[PDB]
């Protein structure tokens, strides 16, 4: 009966919007849906055996003119190997490095802030690693609906082949990839518009076999609360 609980139904496939940046320049954007998640790879000839939809980062020669940057980006892509795998399991987003390119992740804004912040951690190689929990996200989302100020962050940013930009802008980095589960973007936006001049608003979760929902502010909050109770916490 709770239409938001479709998000956690076994077999459901979230849409992941993947945006790649070469030195602060957008060079790639694609939305994928896959049960085994995705894998950010460096070439078309990778390794089919590894599960997950292969997301091939483009050759810098198609977008860049800096020969020095092109060479360094090409070396990063060629060392990606198996690549960076991102998949979903329940209320968690998991990440694992399958190549030799150290990758550092962080949950941040839709656009990486001019100021900076730092990494939330390094993507592990020899084992799995959680990079996002839907649990605390909805809890913050509910708190946000209650007008407590700050919307929850949902944009996963990955720094590939280099350490995280702490003492330098993110635009200096060779390969920066943003991955946004479009359902989270939709949820936040629905919360944002929820407290405005309209009885009902439309939210589209952009997940498999989902229809656009038209809810009032209070029943959207109610659905959020019920979704929370059904989720796991320590």
């Amino acid at each position: 009966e709770n239409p938001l609980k479709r998000l956690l139904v076994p077999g459901e496939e979230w849409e992941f919007e993947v945006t790649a940046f070469y030195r602060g320049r957008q060079v790639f954007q694609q939305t994928i849906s896959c049960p085994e998640g995705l894998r950010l790879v460096g070439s078309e000839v990778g390794d089919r055996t590894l599960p997950g939809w292969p997301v091939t980062l483009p050759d810098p020669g198609m977008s860049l003119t800096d020969r020095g940057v092109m060479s360094y980006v090409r070396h990063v892509l060629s060392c990606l190997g198996g690549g960076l795998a991102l998949w979903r399991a329940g209320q968690w987003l998991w990440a694992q490095r399958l190549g030799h390119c150290h990758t550092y992740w962080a949950v941040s804004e839709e656009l990486l802030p001019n100021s900076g912040h730092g990494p939330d951690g390094e993507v592990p190689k020899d084992k799995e690693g959680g990079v996002f929990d839907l649990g605390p996200f909805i809890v913050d989302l509910i708190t946000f609906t209650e007008g407590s100020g700050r919307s929850p962050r949902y944009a996963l940013w990955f720094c590939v082949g280099e350490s995280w930009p702490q003492d330098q802008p993110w635009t200096k980095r060779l390969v920066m990839v943003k991955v946004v589960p479009t359902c989270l973007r939709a949820l936040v936006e629905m919360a944002r518009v929820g407290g405005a001049s309209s009885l009902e608003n439309t939210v589209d979760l952009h997940i498999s076999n989902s229809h656009p929902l038209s809810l009032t502010s209070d029943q959207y909050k109610a659905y959020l609360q019920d979704l929370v109770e059904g989720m796991d916490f320590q």
Partner: peptide, 14 residues
């Protein structure tokens, strides 16, 4: 160029 300075890439092995 040359070497690739200040990259976070572990040595190759297969």
């Amino acid at each position: 160029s040359g070497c690739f300075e200040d990259l976070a890439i572990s040595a190759s092995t297969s």
